[PDB]
Amino acid sequence: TFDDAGANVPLITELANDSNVQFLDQDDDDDPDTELYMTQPFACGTAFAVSVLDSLMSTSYFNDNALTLIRTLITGGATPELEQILAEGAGMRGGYCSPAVLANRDRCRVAQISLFDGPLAQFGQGGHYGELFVYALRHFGILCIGLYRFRDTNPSSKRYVITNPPEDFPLLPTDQVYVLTYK
Amino acid sequence: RKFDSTGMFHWCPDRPLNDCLQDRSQASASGLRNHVVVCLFADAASPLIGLRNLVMPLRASNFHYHELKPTIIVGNLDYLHREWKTLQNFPKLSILPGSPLNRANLRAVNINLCDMCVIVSAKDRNMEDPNLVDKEAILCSLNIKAMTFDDAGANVPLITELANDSNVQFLDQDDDDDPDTELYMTQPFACGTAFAVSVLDSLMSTSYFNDNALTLIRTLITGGATPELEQILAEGAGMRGGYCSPAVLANRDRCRVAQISLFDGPLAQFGQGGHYGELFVYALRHFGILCIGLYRFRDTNPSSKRYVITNPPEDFPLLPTDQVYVLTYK
Amino acid sequence: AANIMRVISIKNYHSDIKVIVQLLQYHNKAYLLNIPSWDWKRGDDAVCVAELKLGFIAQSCLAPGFSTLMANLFTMRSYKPTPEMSQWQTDYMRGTGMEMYTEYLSSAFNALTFPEAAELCFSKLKLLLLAIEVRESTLAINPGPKVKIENATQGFFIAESAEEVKRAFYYCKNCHANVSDVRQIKKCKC
Ligand SMILES: [Ca+2]
Ligand SMILES: [Ca+2]
Ligand SMILES: [Ca+2]
């Protein structure tokens, strides 16, 4: 308790055994028949476990550049030159740099924008995903790749991911949108 | 100069290790060239490998002090404290702490300018797995061959002490690996870049059947460790010694094994088309030098690898790129 | 250490084999980089479960939930609606069905800027386009109006399956593709 809270604080837990995911949460109807990706803590993004990476072996054989796309997003830009520089055993060297290289200080980041207030709010009140996608890319140069929606509406704080919803998918003013943005 | 009590080795008074200890800045500030690097793998707990036996032949008194190859050991500091008690009487010796796999350590000792790098491991074989037992010696050998040294790489001279002979497969490429092949036939052994303790196991026989042939070996490979020196060491004082009588200093002349190139120099003549035989004769005759074999390039027409040829036939053709193993008195 | 040996043994047998290796600690990845034939440009790779795990979790600090976005994106799964499953679970499940795929954009995309090509994919094709291979080779994520689609540009897409993404290859522009059941899209005469 943090009075001048509690279950409202944002958490992510790295699990070592996936089946221990049952104990991270309540009001969630635990069943060990259920594989990790279907469980409520994983759908909410509060639970990560190393097992969900084991498909990356396949993805490499079948699309190497899709792993390089992952590696560039999730590392924030660890290029082959940096791991060469680290393999030289000196540690990260570096100091004020040429504006030249500094040019790469502009990269796409994944980010979250809320539809509660702001230009996009309009789409929030009844709009459909589709509209947003278009308006956004068009006016702001921002791709929308999914939603982070409250699980309860009518009352817990938990939200869940929705990857790339349909064009006619209805929005709520409380939704948050995952986006790729250049600034 | 000072020498040990039998005059067989160059010598210096004791010293604490911190006199020979260096960091990377000190190593790279020192003018290390034509030196020997020992890449030592050890835990602080590992058994003593006896590096005195490595350093001592490189300090035989039949070398002038200016031609003694300086020596730097890269490895675990706590292990080297335990061993230093044996090393402390040899001159031109240095220690750089930390892993030999660390490319900065290697770059700081000028690894590209050494006359040889020795990869040696001291860690235990209490390890159950015959594939993992050499993993550091293999990784170190490969790591050194991959570096770049622009103002190189696979051109730097290496010798690797293997703990399991069958791991010799991984030391080299373009070599057609086959585990049916016993160690002495493999390319790394024929090139002299790979040594393993198994090739010594015949020395039991050689002793029973010719004791003096082992004493001939022992006098060459140790640089002259006589029975009197191992008596003096068994007294538990360590190597005593100081400036010595010219008398004993007389033994500062012994035969050494050495390498002479037929590229330029008096013997060059034989190089251009001659046959081994001729050289043997000319040499012994004019220089008092026996020729006992050749160290020939494997590729001609283009890699740097060379191979040994023990005592070739009289009519065996020479090349201007050959190097000759010789026994020489000066 | 055992997996580094294997990689050493495989490369020792023949250099040009593409090797993909799983590592459980980044501090060991270096070793592999030295093997004298690891060539990232050739295809060799090292999926490091540490680098990736902690990485995903990091991204989730900057954008909560991301790690469950991406993890689902890189595992193959068909959508399977059922009774006995809540509204939020059906929406989540539909999302877990999608995976990342890659395909060559059709000739109809030539000289489009990337934003209008991506708009065209979402609106007509029912595919989401993230990124393109730009010809030397490089990968560009959501590039601005300055970048235009060259011939045989490879795109990266999110879709329910490989059968879905092929529409972006067969799409023949206004020469054929003007009917709203996307299912219709198929290899045009010219
Ligand atoms: Ca639970
Ligand atoms: Ca080999
Ligand atoms: Ca799918």
From TrEMBL, chain A:
Subcellular location: Cell membrane
Residues annotated to bind Ca(2+) 2: Q22, D25, D28, D30
Superkingdom assignment: Eukaryota
Protein family: Belongs to the potassium channel family. Calcium-activated (TC 1.A.1.3) subfamily. Slo sub-subfamily.
Name of the featured protein: BK channel
Protein source organism: Aplysia californica
Parent-protein residues present: 853 to 1065 of 1070
